[PDB]
Amino acid sequence: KKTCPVNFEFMNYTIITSKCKGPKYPPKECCGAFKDFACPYTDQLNDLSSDCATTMFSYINLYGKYPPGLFANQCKEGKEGLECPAGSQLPPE
Numbered sequence: 759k760k761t762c763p764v765n766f767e768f769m770n771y772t773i774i775t776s777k778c779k780g781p782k783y784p785p786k787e788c789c790g791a792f793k794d795f796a797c798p799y800t801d802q803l804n805d806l807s808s809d810c811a812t813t814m815f816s817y818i819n820l821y822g823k824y825p826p827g828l829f830a831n832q833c834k835e836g837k838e839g840l841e842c843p844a845g846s847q848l849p850p851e
């Protein structure tokens with residue numbers, strides 16, 4: 759895979775961690791915070807030849823102590839699925 763040009767390692771994850779707290783993670787609030795964090799990067803996340811998506815999820819889950827697939831599962835439970843409000847789709851993994 760190509761090296762993701764977005765520096766996920768050093769981004770600010772507080773929009774997610776402040777709104778999405780466990781162990782009873784609120785599904786709608788968690789999905790919304792994840793979309794708010796990740797939807798600006800659909801261009802890079804949806805580059806299937808890059809490691810952007812796997813890198814992003816690795817840091818979300820590391821910094822927030824979240825189970826892998828949590829946000830993918832929660833958003834797929836929601837009315838909008840993994841769709842960003844501007845129309846693009848976030849990858850599940």
Ligand SMILES: *[C@@H]1O[C@H](CO[C@@H]2O[C@@H](C)[C@@H](O)[C@@H](O)[C@@H]2O)[C@@H](O)[C@H](O[C@@H]2O[C@@H](C)[C@@H](O)[C@@H](O)[C@@H]2O)[C@H]1NC(C)=O
Nearest residue numbers: 767768769770771772773774775776777778791794795
């Ligand atoms: C990351 O952003 C933090 C602010 O996030 C916003 O405000 C909070 C209250 C919440 O609403 C969130 O959704 C918003 O995006 C910011 O506070 C934090 O900075 C760190 O803490 C502050 C108090 C300073 O000490 C600063 O030096 C710290 O870095 C941001 N974190 C980083 C690592 O930049």
